[PDB]
Amino acid sequence: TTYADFIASGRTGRRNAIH
Amino acid sequence: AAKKGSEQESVKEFLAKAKEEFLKKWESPSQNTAQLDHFDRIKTLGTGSFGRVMLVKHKETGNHYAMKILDKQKVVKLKQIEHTLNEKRILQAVNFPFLVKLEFSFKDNSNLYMVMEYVPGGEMFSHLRRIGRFSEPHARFYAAQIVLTFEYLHSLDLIYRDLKPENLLIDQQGYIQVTDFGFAKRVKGRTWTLCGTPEYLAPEIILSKGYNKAVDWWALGVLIYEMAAGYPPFFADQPIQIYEKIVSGKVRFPSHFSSDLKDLLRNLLQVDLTKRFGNLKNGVNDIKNHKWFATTDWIAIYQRKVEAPFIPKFKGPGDTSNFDDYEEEEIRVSINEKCGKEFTEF
Numbered sequence: 001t002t003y004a005d006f007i008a009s010g011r012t013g014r015r016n017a018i019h
Numbered sequence: 020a021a022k023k024g025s026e027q028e029s030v031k032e033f034l035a036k037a038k039e040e041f042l043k044k045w046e047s048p049s050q051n052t053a054q055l056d057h058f059d060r061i062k063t064l065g066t067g068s069f070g071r072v073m074l075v076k077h078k079e080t081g082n083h084y085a086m087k088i089l090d091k092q093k094v095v096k097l098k099q100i101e102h103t104l105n106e107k108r109i110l111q112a113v114n115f116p117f118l119v120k121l122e123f124s125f126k127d128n129s130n131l132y133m134v135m136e137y138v139p140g141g142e143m144f145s146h147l148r149r150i151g152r153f154s155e156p157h158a159r160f161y162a163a164q165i166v167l168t169f170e171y172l173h174s175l176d177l178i179y180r181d182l183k184p185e186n187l188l189i190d191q192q193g194y195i196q197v198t199d200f201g202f203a204k205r206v207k208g209r210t211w212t213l214c215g216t217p218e219y220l221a222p223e224i225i226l227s228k229g230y231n232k233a234v235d236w237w238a239l240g241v242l243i244y245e246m247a248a249g250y251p252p253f254f255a256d257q258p259i260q261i262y263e264k265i266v267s268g269k270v271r272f273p274s275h276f277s278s279d280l281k282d283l284l285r286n287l288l289q290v291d292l293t294k295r296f297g298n299l300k301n302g303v304n305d306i307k308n309h310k311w312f313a314t315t316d317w318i319a320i321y322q323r324k325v326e327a328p329f330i331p332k333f334k335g336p337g338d339t340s341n342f343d344d345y346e347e348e349e350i351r352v353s354i355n356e357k358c359g360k361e362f363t364e365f
């Protein structure tokens with residue numbers, strides 16, 4: 001499921017800005 | 020969405036007075052309105068690339084505040100001088116129910132300090148990740164507050180440029196307070212700076228075009244999607260893969276998204292600027308009059324008269340239970356002034 005793919009991803013914590 | 024009737028004229032009049040008040044403060048900013056030993060430092064509430072946000076207690080009143088601390092030398096190394104001057108000049112000038120209130124600012128030899136109202140309910144991010152996703156009525160309630168906040172900011176020629184659940188705090192009434200104006204900018208033209216957060220970047224930022232306030236409306240689409248799905252519309256472990264998805268022009272929706280929600284998001288997550296809601300002839304009213312918002316009483320939201328989805332738990336004044344724990348670092352103030360000329364106007 002896309003949910004499950006998200007939860008196993010490295011992007012579920014707080015996301016830093018870029019610049 | 021095109022109709023200009025009595026309600027639209029009232030909005031116009033409100034925004035005209037709001038701009039007169041903003042410009043007075045924009046042209047004559049407050050400076051040096053407290054000092055560090057006016058506060059007892061309690062606990063770190065969050066961190067960022069320039070320093071930390073700390074819970075503090077103001078000694079003379081006993082009020083609690085959130086104190087953002089920026090190391091001037093780190094700001095310079097990250098080439099964020101002008102952005103940090105923007106942040107403070109804008110935050111001290113704005114006034115809107117869903118924007119955090121800056122109460123004091125000052126600087127010392129080492130650091131910049133912005134002391135804001137403490138918003139005890141924690142980040143939307145925390146609640147959203149824990150519960151998984153919000154119902155459409157609850158996502159709508161939060162989205163309506165962002166729509167009004169962007170209507171206000173954009174009318175002042177401000178672009179916000181970092182919408183995400185991490186930057187939205189939940190207050191004791193269950194309403195939103197936007198924080199982190201680190202990328203906010205007052206601009207009448209287009210602008211060009213590569214900034215924001217990967218999942219929320221509009222295609223035109225990624226592609227190094229000039230861009231305008233339409234990037235905030237794209238980011239609203241990302242936020243509504245993430246609130247209602249539990250995950251953002253474009254994600255991958257490597258940012259370049261996120262960017263490839265953003266610019267592709269493709270988006271997929273969960274099976275449970277209503278037909279109205281998908282229609283709104285197709286119009287916000289529109290790669291073509293000439294088609295993106297918020298950027299058309301009717302401006303924000305294409306969004307405010309969309310079917311997905313038909314139940315939204317925009318004035319009742321502004322007045323905070325709408326029952327919130329939830330009230331954050333509150334154990335007492337100065338409680339931080341709705342925030343994560345962070346490693347504490349001692350605040351060091353050098354005996355030599357650092358970067359004084361760069362930050363003279365702060």
Ligand SMILES: Nc1nccc2c(S(=O)(=O)N3CCCNCC3)cccc12
Nearest residue numbers: 064065066072085135136137138185198
């Ligand atoms: N007024 C405030 N009251 C509580 C918390 C506040 C925070 S914060 O630590 O929650 N913060 C830090 C990490 C970067 N993302 C924004 C969230 C930031 C700014 C103002 C706050």
